[PDB]
Amino acid sequence: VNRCIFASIVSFDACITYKSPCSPDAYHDDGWFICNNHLIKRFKMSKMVLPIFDEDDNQFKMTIARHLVGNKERGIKRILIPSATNYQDVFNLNSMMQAEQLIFHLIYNNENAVNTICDNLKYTEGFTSNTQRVIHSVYATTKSILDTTNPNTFCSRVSRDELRFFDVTNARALRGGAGDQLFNNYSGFLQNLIRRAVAPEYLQIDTEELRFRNCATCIIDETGLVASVPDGPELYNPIRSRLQIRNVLKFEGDTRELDRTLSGYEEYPTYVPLFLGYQIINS
Amino acid sequence: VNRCIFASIVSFDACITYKSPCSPDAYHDDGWFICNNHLIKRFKMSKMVLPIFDEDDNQFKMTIARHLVGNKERGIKRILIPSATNYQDVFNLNSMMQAEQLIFHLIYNNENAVNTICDNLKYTEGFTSNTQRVIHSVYATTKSILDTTNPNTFCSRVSRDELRFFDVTNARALRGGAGDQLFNNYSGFLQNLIRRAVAPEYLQIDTEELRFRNCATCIIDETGLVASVPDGPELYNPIRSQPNRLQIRNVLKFEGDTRELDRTLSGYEEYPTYVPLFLGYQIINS
Amino acid sequence: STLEMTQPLLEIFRNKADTRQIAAVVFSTLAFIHNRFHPLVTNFTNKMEFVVTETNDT
Amino acid sequence: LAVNRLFGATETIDFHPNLLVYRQSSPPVRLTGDVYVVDKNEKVFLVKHVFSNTVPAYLLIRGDYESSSDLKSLRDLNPWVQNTLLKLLIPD
Amino acid sequence: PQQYINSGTEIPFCDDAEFLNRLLKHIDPYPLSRMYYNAANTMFYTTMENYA
Ligand SMILES: [Zn+2]
Ligand SMILES: [Zn+2]
């Protein structure tokens, strides 16, 4: 059994085959439905796991993603996610295959274009072929994924009080706030996706309220989410894999054998986390 | 050697599945520069020969086409070949492969081709990569082919006389018709396609005439070729005509019975039920 | 299993009104046997046919 | 029977599916009058008939039995016969 | 003959590997080795029951 939405992706013709397929995790159950391959490919992110002490080494764990954006690029190039307000502006959908553009119109509820292209395809030979039933199978899949209640299961729980606020804790980080109001207006599938991705800064428990990083990684953004440090210069995001300058005015660095001397010491990884706001959980 | 325009066509993609159907037409030699596969795919037509009759063995038979438009088709559906003003709407460009679209643009000879695509590709990884090389190479080959088709100038392939005519008398005789204007607007390539495809209902031999159909098969519009006739309804379109299966025939009492109704009828010649494209007029002189 | 088992196997023969399903099954069996003798999925003289004898005295 | 009610029988056979011969029949079959697809899948159909020009009834059939296009809808029929079918189909 | 066969080129097959493996597992327990000798004996009996 396999679940990645990008493995559910199909191509209308043998050429333009949807090759370079999903990461094998597509056989897993994760509730991302994106394979990590596609998550890298489309949005410059890679998912990750917080190990939580279950009051113990006992299993408590939470999902995370690092972003893969660089330190120099700005605006749209920093954008992580769009709104329907701008999803076409970000994707340049025409470059994309027709089923991809279709599925984006699904996510952003562009029923107009959806039905337009559906009606155009009806009489095409390849849509008298069961491409219709394929696309509506994808539809049904999403329908199940939101049959789990899009508001009630996702957040409007009867344990309603166990809420995530993604608003910035800092009272001076005032560009946040109504970003949480936007969150309600993003489609619930995406709300759930965020609820996966984003580590809280804090959690209230009946045990205690507790604090996990000093300061927030980014902020909520007014179209879709962006590499959005609350203040100051963008933090150096390194990159792990044309007639331009690439000067790096390095220190001379003659202290050879450094690694053979020090390697036992903790080799601090750098990839940016996703602390944001306050979760609440009963007991 | 290959001579189909479409054998040129290849594009950057993950795909290793290019579906090029290009028929024997490519290595045949009749200057269509397009395989029947595409005559089908885009243009819903079939290549034919008129067995031009001669008492001499030199029958000097002639190229022809016939269209495949279904009788149920309406308007744009019956439009065979749009004008530059209409093609972009007629065809699902973006669904069609990028380079194919671009090629269509160039066939229409629009600057907008380079205005748009040549810029638009800039961002693409393939534009960044050597594949730019292959792309523009195939482009240049296409340009060369177009220049070979170019009639416009004496420093060019085509020269001297012309004697075909079109815009033949309407029954209700509405004045004139810009069909030569459209003809000239169309690339001489398209004009050669018309020459390949379109029979005249009359041929005037130098000092003699012969006529071959009561009435024209096709009509022309400023927007494009129309698969229609001035009058009545459209003629009946000749309709387009291994695993285990549960349905296994029952025994019958081992009889052939009345062969006649199929036998003698098959002995009788069965009509070539097709829609040959007659539209226009031809003359000859010493 | 592909062959539209509307019925359990035995029911088929407990019926005698049919010949269709029976001959189909038989032919499929012969195909499988020949295939195991011959790693070459194939078809034969493309006419063959069958009869169910129905009397002890036949 | 369309309407009338049986009398005078003293014993009954219970329905069983095997009774419904799927006549292989000739490839072409042509039929007329009201037609109601019982099951496209099983090639089952119901058709109007009268005996002696006066005895309205419906006839079950199963097989090729191809007919005019004018497929009629179960909706239209009488509750009487509809109940009757509902049981007799025994989709249970 | 009681039937025709279309008798043209036909072969059936199926490929639902997971399905087939599911079948295999369901089948696993049976000591068929034992269980089928009696079947062969059935055919034997029938060989003489064939005639009285
Ligand atoms: Zn995927
Ligand atoms: Zn070609």
XYZ file of C-alpha atoms in Angstrom, chain E residues 13-30:
18
model
C -3.157 -13.873 -17.003
C -3.111 -11.850 -13.796
C -0.290 -9.986 -12.095
C -1.473 -8.684 -8.697
C 1.698 -9.929 -7.012
C 0.660 -8.733 -3.548
C -2.744 -10.367 -4.020
C -1.093 -13.620 -5.092
C 1.213 -13.550 -2.072
C -1.776 -12.946 0.188
C -3.263 -16.080 -1.356
C -0.017 -17.975 -0.781
C -0.004 -17.032 2.893
C -3.627 -18.057 3.346
C -2.702 -21.358 1.682
C 0.432 -21.867 3.762
C -0.671 -24.182 6.606
C -2.011 -27.119 4.687
